[PDB]
Amino acid sequence: INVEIKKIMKANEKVTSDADPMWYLKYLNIYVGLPDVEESFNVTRPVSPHECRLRDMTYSAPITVDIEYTRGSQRIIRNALPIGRMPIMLRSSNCVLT
């Protein structure tokens, strides 16, 4: 979680369409955050492993990345765009119980 994720992201930093040159998209930094649950109102609250055990849920934390890309102009930036979610091993660095 701490280093290899960033190494992979660096290994795949840049993407560019062969059609219409001068357009591209670059990744800058990627984080993993803390575990949480998506309730039914586009809002989140933190969880504990036992609540996940009871509710047949998954104990995971969101993956977030900051991005740099172009649309007409190149000066478009996003800072905390999420990509997905990663399961969390218990008593790891990002867990609640540590």
Partner 1 sequence: QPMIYICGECHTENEIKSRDPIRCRECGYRIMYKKRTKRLVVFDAR
Partner 2 sequence: RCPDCGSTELVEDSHYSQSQLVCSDCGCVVTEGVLTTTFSDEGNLREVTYSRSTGENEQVSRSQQRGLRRVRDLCRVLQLPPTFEDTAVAYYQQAYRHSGIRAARLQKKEVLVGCCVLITCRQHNWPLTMGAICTLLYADLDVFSSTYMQIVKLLGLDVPSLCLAELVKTYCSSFKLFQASPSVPAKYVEDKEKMLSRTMQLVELANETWLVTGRHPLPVITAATFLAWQSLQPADRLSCSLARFCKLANVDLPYPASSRLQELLAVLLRMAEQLAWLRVLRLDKRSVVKHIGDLLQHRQSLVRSAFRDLLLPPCMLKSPKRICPVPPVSTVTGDENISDSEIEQYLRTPQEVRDFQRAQA
Partner 3 sequence: VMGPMLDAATRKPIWRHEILDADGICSPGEKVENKQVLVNKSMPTVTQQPQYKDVPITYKGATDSYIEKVMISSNAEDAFLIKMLLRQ
Two tokens, residue 15: 């993407």
Q: Within 31-60, which residues bind partner 2 (CB under 8 A)?
A: 38, 40-44
Output the CA torsion sign for 24, 29, 31, 37: negative
β partners of residue 15? 25
For residue 88, what are the contacts with CB-CB under 8 A and spacing of at least 6? Answer: 35, 59, 60, 61, 94, 95
Is 54 a residue that touches partner 3 (CB under 8 A)? yes
Is 40 a residue that touches partner 3 (CB under 8 A)? yes
The least CB distance from residue 42 to partner 1, in Å, is 15
Is 97 a residue that touches partner 3 (CB under 8 A)? no
The residues binding partner 2 (CB under 8 A) are 38, 40-44
The residues binding partner 3 (CB under 8 A) are 38-40, 54-57
